[PDB]
Design a protein around this ligand. Structure first.
Ligand SMILES: Nc1nc2c(ncn2[C@@H]2O[C@H](COP(=O)(O)OP(=O)(O)OP(=O)(O)O)[C@@H](O)[C@H]2O)c(=O)[nH]1
Ligand SMILES: [Mg+2]
Length: 412
């Protein structure tokens, strides 16, 4: 029934504090109410401390807040092997101590930031140690994969080609939200050149609320977590769909809010609104899980979608007749009291697997090579319990992820 969550890496923790905020906010549980149902991991104390100093301070147990005073290191190796190792046990312990206390759970919603040290590496083995300790569950990892041109870390790819290959054979469904492609939404669909990280977080903090929160919440067309991976992954590769939200209108500027279904659903497939720089440049969808929430008439959907199924310029895979999982919830969304999110009475958090990422992975793989081609910051990992193996052998890994996402599509 439940779904634990492990927010790993400063980012996964910032986003965590955010997604965790939106929660109580739409459940009437102020600062000090019940008890969360997740944990927080980081090898840099000062960040988890922010959850220990700032807002939502006492809504957590100093037990579900793991820290390694030591060093973060923007390098996979160190975070996965060398350092990150020391903490893992302890980490697990909570996701085994928190996993027990419950009643027939469904899985762990993992929150990490692909291209980091504590986020890429660590998790790599966290999800790793999970796939074995609970192979019998769902492993949906919600990632924030590398901005297409606006990356931060100098190494980023090293850290992301490595978190992909190690987690690939362990996740159930990996959701992806592109940090940059979300900015566009903040520039083009909300207008603000002042987007603090605290915003992107409010956003995913939204799209995510549509996943677990409301879905695990009764409705006219419930959709379990398992449901996802089933209706969402055509193949064992921990396939990565993309998150998209519909009413991303500004709560100040424009106001046409009352945008009946027929509109908000069409607003999902236009590439300028998908929290991912993977513009459907060719990527044929192969399965979409349209999660609606608020006042929505099933016919409105079983029509708004029909209209789409016949737009053709939206070309769905061949081997897939119908790939539209319609998830209907009741309670409308719940916008921050005064952030910058419109606040409509219905939304569409549609996520999907698109042959599109054939790109995004490509462009991120290429990156890697360029540097590896010169070993660049390699000495930083080797000296951290890794080898020419793990790199070269994780490169070959993704290689067959560029072929995979190619074969499962583009062909009939
Ligand atoms: N959406 C979003 N992205 C974030 C946030 N914080 C960081 N990121 C992104 O995630 C990546 C940064 O990872 P870091 O903060 O360097 O590292 P970490 O993953 O926390 O772990 P360490 O490297 O060991 O510190 C960059 O690509 C950032 O753009 C956040 O609050 N929200
Ligand atoms: Mg950090």
């Amino acid at each position: 029934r439940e779904c634990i969550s492990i927010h790993v890496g400063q980012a996964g923790v910032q986003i965590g504090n955010a997604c965790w905020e939106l929660y109580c906010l739409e459940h009437g549980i102020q600062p000090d109410g019940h008890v969360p149902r997740a944990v927080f991991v980081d090898l840099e104390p000062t960040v988890i401390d922010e959850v220990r100093t700032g807002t939502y301070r006492q809504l957590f147990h100093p037990e579900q807040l793991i820290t390694g005073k030591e060093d973060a290191a923007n390098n996979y190796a160190r975070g996965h092997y060398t350092i990150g190792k020391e903490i893992i046990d302890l980490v697990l312990d909570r996701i085994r101590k928190l996993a027990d206390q419950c009643t027939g759970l469904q899985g762990f919603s993992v929150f990490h930031s692909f291209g980091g040290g504590t986020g890429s590496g660590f998790t790599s083995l966290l999800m790793e140690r999970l796939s074995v300790d609970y192979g019998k569950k769902s492993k949906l990892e919600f990632s924030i994969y590398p901005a297409p041109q606006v990356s931060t870390a100098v190494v980023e790819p090293y850290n992301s080609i490595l978190t992909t290959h190690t987690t690939l054979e362990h996740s159930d469904c990996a959701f992806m939200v592109d940090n940059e492609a979300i900015y566009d939404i903040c520039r083009r669909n909300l207008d603000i050149e002042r987007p603090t990280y605290t915003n992107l977080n409010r956003l995913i903090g939204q799209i995510v609320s549509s996943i677990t929160a409301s879905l695990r919440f009764d409705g006219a067309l419930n959709v379990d977590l398992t449901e996802f991976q089933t209706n969402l992954v055509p193949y064992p590769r921990g396939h990565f769909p993309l998150a998209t939200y519909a009413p991303v209108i500004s709560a100040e500027k424009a106001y046409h809010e009352q945008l009946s279904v027929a509109e908000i659903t069409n607003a999902c497939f236009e590439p300028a609104n998908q929290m991912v720089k993977c513009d459907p440049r060719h990527g044929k969808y192969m399965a979409c899980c349209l999660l609606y929430r608020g006042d929505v008439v099933p016919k409105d959907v079983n029509a708004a979608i029909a209209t789409i199924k016949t737009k053709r310029t939206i070309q769905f895979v061949d081997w897939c007749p119908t790939g539209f999982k319609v998830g209907i919830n009741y309670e409308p969304p719940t916008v921050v009291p005064g952030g910058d999110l419109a606040k409509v009475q219905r939304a569409v958090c549609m996520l999907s697997n698109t042959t599109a990422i054939a790109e995004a992975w490509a462009r991120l793989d290429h990156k890697f090579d360029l540097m590896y081609a010169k070993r660049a910051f390699v000495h930083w990992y080797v000296g951290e319990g890794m080898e020419e193996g793990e790199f070269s052998e994780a490169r070959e890994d993704m290689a067959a992820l560029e072929k995979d996402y190619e074969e499962v599509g583009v062909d009939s």
